[PDB]
Ligand binder design. Structure first.
Ligand SMILES: O=C(O)[C@H]1O[C@@H]2O[C@H]3[C@H](O)[C@@H](O)[C@@H](O[C@H]4[C@H](O)[C@@H](O)[C@@H](O[C@H]5[C@H](O)[C@@H](O)[C@@H](O[C@H]6[C@H](O)[C@@H](O)[C@@H](O[C@H]7[C@H](O)[C@@H](O)[C@@H](O[C@H]8[C@H](O)[C@@H](O)[C@@H](O[C@H]1[C@H](O)[C@H]2O)O[C@@H]8CO)O[C@@H]7CO)O[C@@H]6C(=O)O)O[C@@H]5CO)O[C@@H]4CO)O[C@@H]3CO
Ligand SMILES: *[C@H]1CC(=O)N(c2ccc(NNc3ccccc3)cc2)C1=O
Ligand SMILES: [Zn+2]
Ligand SMILES: [Zn+2]
Ligand SMILES: [Zn+2]
Lengths: 274, 274, 274, 274
């Protein structure tokens, strides 16, 4: 029998980390990746399961994610090294039936632990199932080069930042009609910043952090990568245009209304009012 | 018998799309490619043709493309994965006797359909055949990065933009003396955008969609790729000098007038006036 | 038996050169890279050892490096060509028990000689041992594109340069809390530059050569790569922000101390108080 | 301000129970009804809300239904009396932010509590959101007079039972292509019967309990009533024909394929096999 590394999800995880390394958003060990699975998916690969599932408690209870398996990226690992050693960089966990801990059933070899952003990754998983009726399954974080440079010149508010991104290209409005949410500056790695991010996940599928990076979610990896990929391309044009002397002509407010009606999308009221 | 995946026109598609994802042009699902073929080309590959060709009516009758087969890229597909699975992403179609629709013969599995810009393809394919006596065989669309940012700062004029594009490099004038078409901003995926795009093809081989991208048309795949990339290089040259404070010396009109007649080429008279 | 070229350190250094090759940092033959080894790491591979080891005396005595084996690159050797020929581009040397000479054991064939900057690498190799108690093992030098351009604009003072890099990315204060030291411009390849470069290595892990390149040290082959990669990305963001027109809001001094307080890193007082 | 008793959802809950009383399926206090609302629906009626919302703990957590309001019928109430005193027979509940209980805001005066079959209603509400993508909102239970008679004489199996009601009338195929579910006889009002009912709701929108009654689901009250109404009328002609001696000519298996293909409806596999 083929080992678990030949499964459909493991091969998918290599594709995401390999291509992000060529894009240039994951210098050193920046970025994380988590995926949601089903109990039927991992059924044939019971042989690979470790004989000692390590148990790690949860920071706070998550009743909604009871008996839910995930495949995550280990902490302190290089995204470029994932394609070379899947066993030592990845792993699978399963949330207990109570919602206060998980068991490491494979991977994370040599006392490796999941990403330190797990409280942010798990809290946003819960708030997106409710807002999508169990469709979104993937959470991704990356330090988009063109998005970080924007937070130093643009006002740090939800309205104007979302409006600016809509004018970067035509397809931007269609992909994320709900806009993006930007927080004030906060120290990473704390639960106080995970709650704020999870609060903004209730209304948007794209989250911005000033001077740090970006957050996104989607149904599958291909659709999740496309959401971030489209967002960064719009930022690339703006930085190039802004250094030329600033914007001169752009899409009018009424023009975006006509675009929204054709594709059956509802633009954000706050942003369109600008 | 050699598989259809190894044919010359299939190997042409895998080369052209992969060379566009590596240039940062086709984020998400942006981009499509239709190439005209002959009945002799598809004759040896009758074994792999589908036994139940689904019939899909065309929006408008196209008598000039009757009995003319085409190869198309699927709608909503990702240019990164075309090399990974050409059959699920590429397809072949054939126009019926009366020019009212088309049949699916191979590819486009799992209820896949040709690209949503198909009406914009056939309206321009028919016109380009008339202008160049059937030499044209490729239609290319992609989201070049530096090209789009030019529309945000320069006047959206056919003559003005072509004039600037000629001064960016010495080879640009010879490659496209006919100039590049420009259109107002409009909603994609409609037959109205198909008419306007095909209408301007009577006098230009390239059309620029503001804030969206570019439209290509040429005799073969190799020249079509280099037809737009020549304008992309002039844009990258233009972008760098613009941020420097402006352009101070360039090719003068008196230098340009003698250049074309060295090669015996007829320049665009409208741009020569400026 | 297995060739020494199939060991861990030979394959490991092949990665480091090729990765930096595509970044655009090491055109022609610029840049250097050495790694410290152990006697046990090379014990079983005496088969590839040269029968007669050539002897070269050191310019100045180095007592701390006595009887220690190293692996280095060759002078006048491009970083691209290494993967095509491991033997003709690398070499392993072992300093004598006195600290005055070394013998070439394997590699460096065809009268190959180590890099001309060997005094600068050996001087910094010894002095980093005192500071890190033998943890650091790699010294790297390469022409980082965006760090070179910064010295033309920013003043060459430790307090100003360190603060700007800390503000271009959140993680910078955690990666190099000691700051970056700046030297005056000197003629390369001499011994005067080697003594000043080592002088700054007592209080910095990143030393900048104006208009020439950067120096950095790391515990392993990958940590030293990320250290330069993290610092390069920070300078890349600062280049666009400064070129876009200016910098308007920033991370305040109160936030900077709070960020370093959480991760247990002491910022440089002189630059922090700015 | 218009009274809450004249709202669009209270006047719609009277109609559903009054109409079933004239059918005869709700003798004494048999049957109950629940409806899902939105927070905007009950916002204007804040004035009439009780100042001391009673808190009732739930048997088991229901995290998916957090912060969701409903309207239900009381326990031990007569369907005939709802039109006489709406405030004593109906009530408004709201699940808390965690999912372990609910409050009572209006109605159910003189210490009245919701129906004893709420866990069955709540568990089916949660499940049908996943299998339908948030469209089904209503759950109804009633004792069909004839459908009980069919159980005493027909084999208690899912396959033949589904196919027989499919032969009653032509519209039966279109309305419920997924058939009906039949459970082994268990004592009503238990948590075991609630879990078993929810499992069958993952496939079909009609559930049969032997000798007791029926369950239904739909987007609105009118659409939910017509599902059971169509099922009952189809079962009416069955016993009428059956009591005359049995069937003599019925619908062939072939005609079920032709009718389903006409309206783009995929029938059940096992039922169509018979
Ligand atoms: O109404 C309910 O929400 C509840 O409200 C009141 O409770 C408040 C507490 O009095 C108050 O101190 C505070 O609680 C904090 C607590 O002090 C902290 O220590 C921490 O709690 C963590 C806990 O220490 C940790 O062990 C774990 O808890 C799990 C628990 O061990 C495990 O057994 C299970 O709990 C189940 C419980 O055993 C069941 O009986 C039942 O619980 C009922 C309970 O019996 C009812 O009385 C009622 O609780 C009231 C409570 O009485 C009020 O005082 O309702 C409960 C739900 O039906 O079900 C439980 C779930 O299965 O799981 C526990 C967990 O879910 O994993 O984790 C704890 C969280 O990290 O934090 C709490 C919260 O800050 O605040 C309470 C809310 O106001
Ligand atoms: C949300 C859902 C839920 O049930 N929660 C919760 C709160 C408190 C709690 N306390 N448990 C406890 C307290 C003291 C001693 C033993 C157990 C358990 C669960 C939420 O927060
Ligand atoms: Zn980050
Ligand atoms: Zn496009
Ligand atoms: Zn140098």
């Amino acid at each position: 029998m083929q080992n678990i590394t030949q499964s459909w999800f493991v091969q998918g995880m290599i594709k995401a980390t390999t291509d992000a390394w060529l894009k240039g958003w994951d210098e050193r060990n920046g970025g994380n990746l988590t995926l949601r699975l089903d109990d039927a998916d991992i059924a044939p690969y019971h042989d690979n399961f470790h004989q000692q599932p390590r148990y790690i408690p949860l920071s706070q209870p998550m009743p909604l994610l009871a008996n839910t398996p995930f495949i995550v990226t280990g902490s302190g690992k290089f995204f470029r090294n994932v394609q070379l050693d899947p066993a030592a960089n990845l792993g699978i966990v399963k949330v207990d039936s109570c919602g206060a801990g998980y068991h490491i059933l494979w991977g994370l070899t040599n006392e490796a632990v999941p990403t330190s952003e797990l409280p942010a990754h798990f809290l946003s998983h819960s708030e997106r199932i409710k807002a999508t009726n169990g469709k979104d399954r993937v959470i991704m974080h990356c330090h988009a080069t063109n998005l970080i440079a924007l937070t130093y010149v643009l006002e740090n508010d939800t309205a104007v930042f979302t409006r600016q991104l809509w004018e970067g290209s035509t397809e931007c409005l269609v992909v994320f009609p709900d806009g993006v949410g930007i927080l004030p500056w906060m120290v990473p790695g704390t639960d106080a910043i995970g709650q704020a991010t999870a609060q903004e996940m209730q209304k948007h599928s794209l989250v911005l952090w000033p001077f740090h990076g970006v957050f996104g979610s989607g149904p599958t990896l291909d659709e999740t990568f496309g959401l971030i990929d489209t967002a960064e391309k719009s930022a690339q044009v703006l930085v190039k245009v802004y250094s030329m002397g600033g914007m001169k002509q752009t899409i009018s407010r009424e023009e975006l209304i006509a675009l929204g009606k054709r594709f059956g999308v509802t633009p954000l009221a706050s942003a369109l009012a600008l």
